[PDB]
Amino acid sequence: CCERVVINISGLRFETQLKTLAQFPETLLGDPKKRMRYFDPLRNEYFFDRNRPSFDAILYYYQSGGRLRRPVNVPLDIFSEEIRFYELGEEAMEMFREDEGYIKEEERPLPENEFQRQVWLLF
Amino acid sequence: CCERVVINISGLRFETQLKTLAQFPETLLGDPKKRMRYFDPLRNEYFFDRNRPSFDAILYYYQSGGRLRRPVNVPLDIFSEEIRFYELGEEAMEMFREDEGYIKEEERPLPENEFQRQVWLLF
Amino acid sequence: QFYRNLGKSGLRVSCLGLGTWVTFGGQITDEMAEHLMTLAYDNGINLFDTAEVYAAGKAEVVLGNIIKKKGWRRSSLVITTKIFWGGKAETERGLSRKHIIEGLKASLERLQLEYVDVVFANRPDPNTPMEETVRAMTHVINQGMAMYWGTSRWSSMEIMEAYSVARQFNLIPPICEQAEYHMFQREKVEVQLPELFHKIGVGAMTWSPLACGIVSGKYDSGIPPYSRASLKGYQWLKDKILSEEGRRQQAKLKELQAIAERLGCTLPQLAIAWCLRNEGVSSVLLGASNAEQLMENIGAIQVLPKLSSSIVHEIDSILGNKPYS
Amino acid sequence: QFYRNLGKSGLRVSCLGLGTWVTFGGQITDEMAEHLMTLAYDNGINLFDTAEVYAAGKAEVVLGNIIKKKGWRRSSLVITTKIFWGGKAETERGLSRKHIIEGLKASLERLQLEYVDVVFANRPDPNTPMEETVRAMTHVINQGMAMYWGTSRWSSMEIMEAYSVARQFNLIPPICEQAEYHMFQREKVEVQLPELFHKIGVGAMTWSPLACGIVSGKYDSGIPPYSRASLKGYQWLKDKILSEEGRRQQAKLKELQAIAERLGCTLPQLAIAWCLRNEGVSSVLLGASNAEQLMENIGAIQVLPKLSSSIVHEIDSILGNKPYS
Ligand SMILES: NC(=O)c1ccc[n+]([C@@H]2O[C@H](COP(=O)([O-])OP(=O)(O)OC[C@H]3O[C@@H](n4cnc5c(N)ncnc54)[C@H](OP(=O)(O)O)[C@@H]3O)[C@@H](O)[C@H]2O)c1
Ligand SMILES: NC(=O)c1ccc[n+]([C@@H]2O[C@H](COP(=O)([O-])OP(=O)(O)OC[C@H]3O[C@@H](n4cnc5c(N)ncnc54)[C@H](OP(=O)(O)O)[C@@H]3O)[C@@H](O)[C@H]2O)c1
């Protein structure tokens, strides 16, 4: 509850309460078995040798309770590969792309006849 | 590998693993003989009295594996004089300018006659 | 490997330790206490655990006279002590800086030792800051009164709080943890303690492997004379055996008689080698009242290759108390 | 200059040191041991290296009785000791906090000293954290049992790990390193050690400059009587000389007889001044069994101006083992 958790992102410190990260139990920072391999015991911190400006938006995802947004100086290719590492889910990724506008839900279902399907794609 | 390397850029501290910087052995941070003169033994760190916002793009060059890009608040004259210091090569400089669009490969070869060459430049 | 590290620390302890609770200075005589330690030290045991609360301090006196009489090297022994109850005064209890320094200096004059290997906070203290405990434990290590320190019966949040104060203030973190672990007490050492071992490097030195003699199976026909349940002031152990939850446990121990018969072992040897079956438990503190019991319990190291995966699955179906993470 | 600093540290040692391995307390008598140290101390040697493993602790006893008998000032001597093996018990080995503190205190009663100058970790310990070693080495320096500490046979990664713990926790980093360096062992002191010296300030105190007597050239006609290869329990040195890799080395030493003849020197004086030819090596630990050998080896300081660049190029063509960075 009061236990403060220090997360070190390539030399940048990000102290947080433990009950903030434990709000989302299936992410990398919420599951203690997942983040166990990043613990530095001599410094009492979690060290991630990752991107530095991406994590302030990842940290405020846990503090606000699910409101993440891309920082203005972090591109879409860099920041989307950080959401996949920190494991914020298939569910909070879809809320991210719609805000972004990268909403391409096009899935052409075939006609299923296997030739009615096959001739359909011909036209 | 496991070893962590603290690089101090004018009071801003960046910590990265040694096997990240050793991915690129011919740069200033990859060659241990080159970065030997910047080591602070009383603090166990590399001190560079250099530009501060330039180095986050220089650090993420090593972490991503060769994907560098200019930060939005660092101009082109400041940031290009940082790539020459950190010695990221004649090869990753050309990939930088093409992204930038500063691509001027114009080299007028003369006709080589030495007057066939010389009269050519007259026209 | 008979000798194993204590946590991640460099302190090499044996996989079986000898405790002085009840027996030494209480139940058995000084001459039998001299004979049990010679039998233990000649079998490779170097871990000898005592406390200042045991026998009102008389248990450390008996242990103290044996090391001087036998002339054992202090280098070959690992002597551990526990501090929390010093006496009747209000300043003689707790983990304050006054009592950790006084109570350890008082124990080092009864043990007649220059120093002790591991000093253990015998239980947590809610009326003391964790800074004061970790600074006082660091103080008696830097003065040379102790080498290491550990905690006894502290929850894993209290151990992780004591670890984060030591890194904050550049103090010394604890290396160890004494937790009760037998076949009828599994929740802390299988769920809570393994998580702490891989994170910060705290090992477990588990005590009472036979649950004060219950899992030896001697109490199946009632209360035998001259056992611990019939001693003065131990009505809490007689109420534990004769109650309906304690009568149910003896019905499980008869089912464990068949598994101990399939191996060559007995039921005390089975119940100790079951405690050593994992890499998390760094030692087991025995208790022995005579030389037949101690010779029997040191025979539990041979039963430890006999435990396969299948016998561990078979015992846990009889016990029916495996914890869930 | 004959006196030189030990690393970057302020400790001024002589360029030749005397070691107690084998000769003291073992091979030669106590009366010859008194005569070799008087011959060494009157030639300006202040570095006297011993260990607790040597002669089961009897080598520190012989050294200890000479300093009391001669009445030498402790201020004028640099006494160094090595702590890894204390005895047969499992708690008497390693670089744990129990054995460093316990072990050093046992060596200071055989040496009859109040302190040694540099305590060495005699070899690395894989079963101990580096925090526990650096905290225990810092502890015996702040108690006043030692002034400095160093490491023996540690990989330059292990030395750089021990350095980064000392800056993390505000402890004391090691100043020194003992590494084997002769004409047939060049990889650590010419490649790995130099990098460490300019980065963090660790010097080398190299031992066995004659490779236990091989490079003196005495073993070219087989095994002479009353040399170290014929002593009891040294079959590993006889197997090293008589093997086909060791017979090839004696064919190189005959080629070094011509270079030692061009100078005024002998082959032991050449093989020591070759070890002192660089600024990285801070000292050389000799070994001497009589007064003719020690008087010969202290004559290797005069040969050190005689080595030009060209003789160093000439020896390395004969040796054929120059390491590459
Ligand atoms: N808070 C703490 O840190 C804490 C608390 C308690 C104990 N401890 C440590 O752990 C030790 C005690 O463990 P424990 O004595 O409580 O449980 P055990 O499980 O260690 O108890 C052994 C006692 O049960 C009986 N027993 C043992 N082996 C037997 C065998 N093979 N056959 C028949 N009977 C046998 C003995 O005779 P009897 O049945 O006649 O008595 C003996 O006195 C102490 O020495 C103490 O140092 C620590
Ligand atoms: N791990 C460590 O840190 C470590 C390990 C080993 C040694 N050391 C240190 O280094 C020292 C030992 O060096 P070392 O003794 O092993 O190799 P040396 O190369 O130091 O060995 C000298 C021995 O070889 C023979 N010798 C020396 N000079 C000679 C000469 N001019 N002519 C003929 N024979 C000569 C001697 O007589 P004999 O041939 O009759 O014996 C002598 O006993 C010890 O004192 C010890 O303190 C440290």
Numbering used by the authors:
A (entry chain B), B (entry chain D): 31 to 153
C (entry chain A), D (entry chain C): 37 to 361
Quote the study that presented this structure, word for word.
Voltage-activated potassium (Kv) channels open in response to membrane depolarization to conduct K+ ions, a process that is critical for electrical signaling in neurons and endocrine cells, as well as muscle contraction. Kv channels contain voltage-sensing domains that activate with membrane depolarization, and a central pore domain that opens to conduct K+ ions with high selectivity. The X-ray crystal structure of Kv1.2, a mammalian homolog of the Shaker Kv channel, and those of the Kv1.2–2.1 chimera containing the S3b-S4 paddle motif from Kv2.1 (Kv chimera), serve as a structural framework for understanding the gating mechanism of Kv channels. Since no structure has been obtained for a voltage-activated ion channel in a membrane environment, in the present study we solved the structure of the Kv chimera reconstituted in a lipid nanodisc environment using single-particle cryo-electron microscopy (cryo-EM).
We initially generated a map of the entire complex (α4β4) and obtained an average resolution of the entire map of 3.3 Å. However, the map exhibited a lower local resolution in the transmembrane domain (resolutions of ~4–7.5 Å), likely stemming from the alignment of particles against the cytosolic domain during 3D classification and 3D refinement, and the variability in relative arrangements of the cytosolic and transmembrane domains. We built three models for the Kv chimera: one for the cytosolic domain, another for the transmembrane domain, and a third hybrid model that combines the two models which fits in the overall 3.3 Å resolution map of the entire complex. Comparison of the cryo-EM structure in nanodiscs and the X-ray crystal structure in detergent shows that they are similar. We do see a slight shift/rotation of the cytosolic region of the α subunit and β subunit with respect to the transmembrane domain of the α subunit when compared to the crystal structure, with the most pronounced changes in the β subunit, likely reflecting the lack of contacts between molecules that are present in the crystal of the Kv chimera. Although the highest resolution X-ray structure of the Kv chimera is at 2.4 Å resolution, and our cryo-EM structure is at a resolution of ~3 Å in the cytosolic domain and ~4 Å in the transmembrane domain, our structure in a membrane environment implies that the protein adopts an essentially native structure in detergent in the presence of lipids. We detected only subtle structural changes in the external pore in the selectivity filter of the Kv chimera, as well as a small rotation of the cytosolic region of the α subunit and the β subunit, a region involved in crystal packing in the X-ray structure. Our cryo-EM structure of the Kv chimera in nanodiscs suggests that the structural changes during C-type inactivation are likely not large, and would be compatible with very small movements on the scale <2 Å.
